[PDB]
């Protein structure tokens, strides 16, 4: 989540005074080209480099990726609620995430670089096959980056991470 290795160059800027959502691109400082769901949405020629998605109030969502002098970065699936993507479901105060690639192998999860859904010692965090359940979802505590990966593989090799921000 915090790291860009594995071509996960797009990150959410966590330091806004106003409820605006800014994306950053960790690529060779030159000319950044931004994309959303495959189509180009911007071309930054020097000067600015961060991409503004607007206020977090309009629930920005989509597969965003950037590109400098090299190839496109992997996407960062943004999902606000104030290639097959992660499915997000909200029911009352419960947030359910569904892993995009579930070949029947053991699916593991991480939230901001920390494993979750493993220990049965948590009544509010359950893992059932390709589904991660978060009961009594805490906006300021559980929002952030999520990723599912099969046992044995590196999380960084995931096709893309999910950035979840939800007020419940």
């Amino acid at each position, epitope marked *: 989540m915090q790291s860009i290795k594995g071509n996960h160059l797009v990150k959410v800027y966590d330091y806004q005074e106003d409820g605006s959502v800014l994306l950053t691109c960790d690529a060779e400082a030159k000319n950044i080209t931004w994309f959303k769901d495959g189509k180009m949405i911007g071309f930054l020629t020097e000067d600015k480099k961060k991409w503004n998605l607007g206020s977090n109030a309009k629930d920005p969502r989509g597969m965003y990726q950037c590109k400098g002098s090299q190839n496109k970065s992997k996407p960062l699936q943004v999902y606000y609620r104030m290639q097959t993507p992660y499915k997000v479901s909200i029911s009352g105060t419960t947030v359910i995430l569904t892993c995009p690639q579930y070949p029947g192998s053991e699916i593991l999860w991480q939230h901001n670089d920390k494993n979750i859904g493993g*220990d*049965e010692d948590d009544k509010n965090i359950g893992s059932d096959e390709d589904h991660l359940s978060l009961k009594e979802f805490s906006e300021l505590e559980q929002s952030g980056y999520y990723v599912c990966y099969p*046992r*044995g*593989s*590196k999380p960084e090799d995931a096709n893309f991470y999910l950035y979840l921000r939800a007020r419940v």
Partner: antibody
Amino acid sequence: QVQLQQSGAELARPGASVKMSCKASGYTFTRYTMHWVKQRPGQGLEWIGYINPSRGYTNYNQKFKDKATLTTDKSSSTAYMQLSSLTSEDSAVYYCARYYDDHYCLDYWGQGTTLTVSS
Amino acid sequence: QIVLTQSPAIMSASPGEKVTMTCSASSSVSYMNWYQQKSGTSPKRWIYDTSKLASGVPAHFRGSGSGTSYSLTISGMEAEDAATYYCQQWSSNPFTFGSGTKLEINR
């Protein structure tokens, strides 16, 4: 201080079944998957499968499906592997080993259990 | 599924020589491990995550590689380095081992 103590050598007749053990200590037993490896005389290593002691999740090498059955006993921190419908092809040394996710490898291995299948 | 072809299958090196053994994967893998096994004993974790040496492993050992080609190097063969080395991957299911390289010490 991680230790994996496997059960003693065994002799079983063709067609029978055998259950061997691996007693772990020195780490949180339910926190790491336990794997089993097969090594025939003068041969290489072969992966059988693994089990997650947490809730009993298991996965197998297709070649060992229905031949090997992995189980664990939390209260005794012991993993078990049962081999059924034995033949001379099953005679070999069997190792149990802890998979340490942060290092992506089997970091600690049991001393191994030799299985002889003969009449 | 993923086949790991090790070469050479058998080799011997005089003390002090630089030994290089390779592991070629049939498909790309993000990392490779290496286990050392000496006669009559269990395999030992030797090199993990491609290039990290397990604690206690002589520093003159080195692991490297990427994609479909990996190798283990011994810079300055010592008698105690003689053994059989197996590479292993788990970037794709099922987890698989290479057939091993048997290394003898010349004298």
